[PDB]
Structure 1
Amino acid sequence: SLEKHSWYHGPVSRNAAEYLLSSGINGSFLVRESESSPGQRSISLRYEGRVYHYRINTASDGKLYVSSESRFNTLAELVHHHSTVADGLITTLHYPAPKR
């Protein structure tokens, strides 16, 4: 289901995400699941040669957010929003990492 999205890489470790992004540029990103904890997800984002990792938090009402001020019903809505408005991320989610 989520696999249809360019930016959704499934289970990938933090350190592996950094390798996947190392061919990236500012705004290169991917969304990953924890290999150990099903349902636990993060966004990994490249900026100025480094990778910033943001846990996708779940609100008491089930909404998702990476930045408390901006909350969403679905992950696709969250990513679409943050692709144009950084809103707490170091930069926008602009360039989905090629899946490998």
Structure 2
Amino acid sequence: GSSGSSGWYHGHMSGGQAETLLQAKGEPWTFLVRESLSQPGDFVLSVLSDQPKAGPGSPLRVTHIKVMCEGGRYTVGGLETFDSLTDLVEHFKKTGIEEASGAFVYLRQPYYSGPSSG
């Protein structure tokens, strides 16, 4: 198929992992959906920022956007909700996300990841 169809769901990824995974790629503005192992029922949205730690040669920080699954609806803590992570991701895929540091983030492209790592 020319294009895909929502392929960010890595099933059940580990926060710490995603960080490394996303970093492994380095792709700036890269999000991915992963089930919260620590939080059964909820989910985490790790997005790769274009903001390095040291700069050139350093890994780009990571932002974990927790997903509050309440009332059969998902929310990142905002008034807006959703039924499926798709209607959520595809939603914030444009509006983007806002960090606490005052910086904003955007889900340019999802994380496909591969089988082998190293």
* 1:54 pairs with one of 58, 65, 72: 65
Work out whether 1:82 is the aligned partner of 2:92.
yes
Question: TM-score normalized by structure 2?
Answer: 0.70
CA contact (8 A) 2:41 2:69 kept: no
1:27, CA displacement in angstroms?
Answer: 1.1
User: How far 1:98 moved relative to its partner?
Assistant: 1.9
Structure 1 spans left out of the alignment, 5+ residues: none
What is residue 11 of structure 1 aligned with on the other side? 12
Separation in 1 of the partners of 2:26 and 2:89? Answer: 18
Q: CA deviation at 1:92?
A: 1.7
Cα distance, 1:69 vs. partner? Answer: 2.8
**Runs ≥4 residues deviating over 4 A:** none
RMSD: 1.9
- Which TM-score applies when normalising by structure 1? 0.81
Q: Which has the higher contact order (CA 8 A, sep 6+)?
A: 1
Q: Is the 8 A contact 1:31 1:43 kept in 2?
A: yes
How many percent identity over aligned positions? 33
Please say which of residues 23-32 and 86-95 is displaced more in the overlay.
86-95
> How many pairs were matched up?
96
Q: 1:43 aligns with which of 33, 42, 45?
A: 45
